[PDB]
Write a protein that binds this DNA or RNA. Structure first.
Ligand SMILES: [Ca+2]
Ligand SMILES: [Ca+2]
Ligand SMILES: [Ca+2]
Ligand SMILES: [Ca+2]
Lengths: 445, 440, 440, 445
DNA sequence: TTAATAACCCGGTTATTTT
DNA sequence: AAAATAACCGGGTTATTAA
DNA sequence: TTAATAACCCGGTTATTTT
DNA sequence: AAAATAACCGGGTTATTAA
């Protein structure tokens, strides 16, 4: 059967939380204290080597008050029919079942009065609902819960694994083999994985993802990850560890966006920001996964032009039409753009750059809910609104009259030329500019 | 209310022991392993910090089998009707006490299936007798035995103390202060003391003593002690020698150290008395169970107001340890001659005749553990090694040079003795006390 | 002033090595013993906290014999006349400096008589050449080598850092943050870095490279590196495969992992390029000393201004790596017909007709480390496993269905393939590039 | 060879000490800190495993100031002729031996600059006198001092032992066997023994004794101990660890003083007081060993009477001539004491107590000269001035008219009747009384 | 009846006869 | 010269005689 | 001389003919 | 219906032609 819920009330970080669970569920976050204490919350209920020591003074919320620790595990237990897992758990709970028709089962922990005798006194109780919970009979040192479940903890009989930080003293090619053996191998059914490395998250299927937030209220969001899956997961494996992911389309934009972010603050990686190269203008294949994850996508797009196939003389918009499909709206009409054949070269592109503003001026109301949503659109490319902000400083580097002419020929080659000569006082006006609000929305400040 | 018996059946040394206890138990012996495992048996019965870990494979007897560990305590409450502990312990049992007419109570430990799941498991059972033992109810991690008793273990509610080796890093005046503090204050009511030092047993009264043995069968003797600084070192020895003089111990230390220097670790001890009295020592040592060996010398005494009328002191002094009637007085007329030398020499020839026609009285003396000479110890030493006395004294009579000043010329012997010399002291039947101390 | 050589003679892995060094130098390899013992060989020469303990039995080579341990550091100070560190070195050498025309300096360690007194003993010795080596004067516990240098060892005056494994308990952004700081700051002038992570080698300039081998003779190559995210993972391998496609790496991650999953620990690596350019990679890896293997495919391009005039780009991209002269253009006339499929099918026969009578050019291509196919990789994949493509695709022509979706139908072959299938791929001459990844 | 003297200047407790030390040194005292620092001073001079770590900040005088730690050892080298250790030390110091005529040799230590480089820098120097000290040549890690001396430290070539606390985890007969292995066995020549137990001092000959005082200035008393020896050392083995020793004569006088001393304070066992019972009126055999030790003797005696063996009618004083023999003075003349023959029993003793009081009246200058020295004399018997200050409370427990007559018949048997029941208010008036001034002179408070 | 020395045992001394 | 012999001291134990 | 697309290579999408 | 075919986007490399 599957896990359903856990209700950890008065443990050392939690107040009243209901984390939804599943088999094969993976824990990540920015804090290590909450990811350690969520595994010790499972060790205090299902493992006797932690349950035999009792509760100390430290694991009562902060250190005291509201002295009733409850950990309640939910495991449903109404699959019946085929599997031997449900039979091997229903054959031992026969004094604590209300009927053979209930659909939720309860494994409840209780602990009271740490102020007297300096002991936690864990009482375990079985039942089918929160009314009429009946305590677990056990003769000596061993409960009737401990005969059934088995807990194996890893840090460098129903079996539940608990793995904390396995990539420390592990090779980076071995983590992909461990990512195969955790998920597509049928040996492991019930684990609770805590990790920090993206190579353990390459091959995932039927997996609930618990993200632990960096704030002190330690609230968790549980999302199922259901699904070329491998290239969709390998590029997004470093973006699963970030709440705020900027989606840029090319490698030369990341060269400027690394330096502009590193000249302002080193702590954008510490806050949870990430730069993701899409490699093209295909943004819909990532946000269908990030809608299910709930990761806040930030999208920067540039609009372009295209002649129609069977129609000559009218042009079909590319960037506004591909921004239309991310919201699922009705596509706009085609705009007749005329180019005379006697003028070619740069001046056809120079007239089409002014046509890119002339298709932007009367479609500003379309951008009025685009930029109100999480998609941002430029006017020609990134190389022109780079020139509209710091273009008085680009002339001394290139030693040329028109730096846009020098940059559109070799695109990625001359973005290296902007790296080796910049100042810390330079390029702060492009940081606070309104045309680069995606990098404001990444850092959250 | 006070403890009566323990029944530790299948523990890691014990096989079937019924060890009688009381309050203020004191454990000594030549093995530290059996005393540590006795205190571990009390920790697996009454302490939750050792009960929460369970039994290992090594906690059973040998490496495997005889897999039913019983540690059963006997409390013997009866009805004392004024003490607060008995009313409290009959208040917390409630349903597991069968009647108010019963007097003996049981706390029973069980352990089964060590070969399955690699766990010993401890099951605790209350009851008024060995039949109809009922399980102790407990809700979570806490038994109802844990709400009654408290165990404090010392190694450098109802309170039980367990003290193992407190004289390591402790001054001896602090050992005497701990000795009066253990048996004077009312806070130390229940303990199980394990020690090696004689200074912790100076003040001692109303004390059960457990002497564990050096053998592997780990059987022990329990003796109640109810009522001198050198007698406290004799409590650590099963077999002691009762001698009269400080000059005798100088010879019996040199003769024992030239052959067998490890007689002290086997369990032997030499106890100086300082006189010919032995009835004050064996009346204590019979209650201890300590096997006494007595070497004494017979003497004679004249009467009062009579000349030539004598009685015997040393034969009647051995007779007073039995309870038999005294001997008749022996009359002898002594010649005048040399008073300093030959008047003693007539009495030494008379005392050999007195020992000759009272040999059948000595036949039940030396058959039991009291041994007796015929003149003194010095002529019996002169009959053994008198061919070696004249080569180091340069005198015609070495008994004459040594009877006047005894201790000052006894160190003239022991500074020059070879390792080959005095092998005949062990092989004499006259000096069988020094072989009876060894036990061969 | 910057280092040029070391001579670690009889240390516990080394027999006779003369390892060239420079500043900011980086050690990597497949053994951690051979990278720990290099930093301990520097700590035994230049750090007093390891030199004060002496040599043990295990610090010599093998368990015993070859009993003269020499660690010799070569400075090559020359005459720089402006820097602070050369004058700070030469002001305190004093009497051991021979003349001002000398350019080579020595620090010679010695060790003798390990079998006597259970002590290794370390004797330090300055000098300008290997003849006339004079001892370092030191009055008490402190040498005159200790007044010049300083060693700080990192494990989670003239200052030498020694860093061993810093990415253990370090975040992946912090490795790229540490990667610039070793090579732009003036504080880290002299270090010896040991690592396993590719993120610490992103920013890298003016760096001697020490690669230790997996063999037991622990010989190493000293290569200067002077001047990309996937290329930093290719620095930790000797045999790398240079492929064009991301869909092609999906094809070689099934064939390798169904037979030999331990190819990554042996020292193999798959490097995507993203295009048919290879001259930007092997011009870098010639200075790296990394043995490249290149798999490429030949193509043809019509020339501008003419109809039916073609030239061969795929042979010229193999010609430019060796520096030979280009080939001449060919003429072929192709009819109209079906332009999507049947126009390509005549070009495949013309490409095979080109590949038939240019085989003597390919005879030195495949004799070098560049490998060429016949039309494309998906069509001599059809020569290997084309009898098994019709089970999964259920199509008449599987390469008609595969060329229109190069990546979209490759996961159908990856997701449905047995372990017995694609085992004959390794013994083709067409797919013989993947055997030199393993090295068999 | 023969050690002479050490000179430890600026080490952890010492300021300027010249502690005379021969072969077979035995160290006792009330502090373990100064004995451990004396053995670590010998380890910082002659052991390379302590010299390779150097001096810290903590092993200067307080923690700083007087920045020259100097340990100078004298061995004096001038036995010549026969022994091979003298030939070994004159064969290894072939350079720094100035002549073969001077009879003093030095092994020095120097260290400076604790505040610079945080390192002690021990420099060792050989010399024949304090002028012209010469550095020891050593090639690498090993000095030329380390080839000669060998140091073995025990805590549970010239071979020098250092033993600290060996009686922990040993039997008492093993301590007697270890004393026989140390002193009368010729395996150990040079040692520095530190101990707390009396059983390691039973067999003892040719031994320099260092007593370390309990005060902070750590001054040491250096006395050579030369000598029935075995029972004298068994009597004095618990008295060598005490600086104030009371010399009493009986066990009844011991158990009188034991309850009275324990009801005031338990501090006197911690301070260093000890009651040594003799077993008779022989005191000259104890003070001849305490004069060589320097232990101050406190002596309680009682004066008696004896008839002369050759003259009838004149009595010879025993207790006054016994006190005269301890000072070596001229013995006083005999006093004619008349006893009629018809008066027998205890009626003779009642006049004999008055005749002893009449002897004590006219020889008051002699008892004043005795009590001006370290010997104390009673009026007649301890029981009479027991009765003179307690004996109004001795009639309520004996239920007798005369408690002196009730106690002189059973001297020990009725002495334990005072032990089991006395209040703590009792025997405070006699504790500052002048007749029991030895009991106040034991503790010195 | 009830204490007070003759005698004995484990040790120590000190000045007076004694051959 | 040097080797006893009484008379005490620090502890116990009878037992006859004085009281 | 000197840039500007015609072709080629490693990936992706979306409307328009086409049989 | 479903199978190509242009025309762009994110990167590189020649090479003939307009300029
Ligand atoms: Ca763009
Ligand atoms: Ca005798
Ligand atoms: Ca290809
Ligand atoms: Ca007296």
């Amino acid at each position: 059967m599957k896990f359903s819920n856990i209700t950890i009330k008065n443990f050392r970080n939690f107040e009243k939380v209901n984390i939804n669970l599943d088999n094969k569920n993976v824990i990540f976050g920015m804090n290590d204290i909450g990811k350690t204490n969520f595994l010790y919350a499972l060790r205090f209920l299902l493992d006797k080597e932690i349950r035999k020591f009792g509760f100390n003074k430290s694991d009562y919320h902060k250190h005291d008050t509201s002295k009733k620790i409850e950990i309640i595990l939910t495991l449903d237990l109404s699959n019946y029919e085929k599997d031997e897992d449900t039979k091997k758990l229903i054959s031992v709970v026969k004094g604590a079942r209300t009927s053979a028709n209930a659909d939720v089962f309860y494994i409840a922990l209780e602990s009271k009065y740490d102020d007297k005798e300096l002991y936690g006194n864990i009482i375990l109780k079985w039942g089918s609902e929160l009314d009429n919970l009946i305590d677990i009979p056990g003769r000596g040192n061993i409960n009737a819960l401990d005969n059934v479940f088995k807990v194996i903890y890893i840090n460098p009989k129903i079996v539940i694994y608990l793995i904390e930080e396995p990539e420390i003293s592990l090779h980076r090619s071995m983590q992909i083999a461990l990512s195969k053996q955790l998920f597509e191998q049928s040996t492991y059914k019930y684990f609770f994985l805590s990790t920090h490395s993206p190579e353990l998250l390459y091959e995932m299927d039927n997996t609930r993802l618990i993200r632990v937030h960096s704030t002190e209220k330690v609230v968790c969001s549980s999302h199922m990850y259901n699904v070329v899956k491998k290239k969709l997961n390998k590029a997004l494996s470093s973006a699963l560890f970030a709440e705020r992911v900027l989606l840029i389309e090319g490698p030369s934009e990341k060269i400027l966006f690394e330096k502009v972010l590193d000249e302002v603050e080193p702590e954008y990686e510490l806050n949870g920001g990430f730069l993701l190269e899409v490699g093209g203008t295909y943004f819909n294949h990532y946000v269908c996964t990030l809608n299910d994850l709930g990761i806040t996508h930030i999208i920067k797009t540039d609009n372009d032009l295209k002649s129609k196939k069977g129609k000559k003389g009218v042009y079909e918009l590319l960037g506004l039409n591909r921004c239309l499909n991310l919201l699922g709206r009705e596509n706009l009409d085609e705009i007749t753009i005329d180019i005379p054949e006697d003028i070619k070269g740069k001046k056809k592109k120079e007239r089409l750059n002014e046509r890119k503003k002339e298709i932007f001026k009367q479609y500003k109301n379309e951008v009025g809910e685009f930029l109100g949503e999480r998609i941002y659109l430029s006017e020609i490319d990134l190389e022109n609104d780079l020139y509209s902000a710091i273009g008085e400083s680009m002339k001394r580097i290139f030693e040329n009259e028109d730096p846009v002419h020098y940059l559109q020929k070799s695109k990625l080659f001359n973005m290296v030329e902007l790296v080796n000569n910049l100042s810390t006082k330079d390029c702060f006006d492009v940081f606070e500019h309104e045309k680069f609000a995606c990098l404001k929305e990444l850092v959250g400040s």
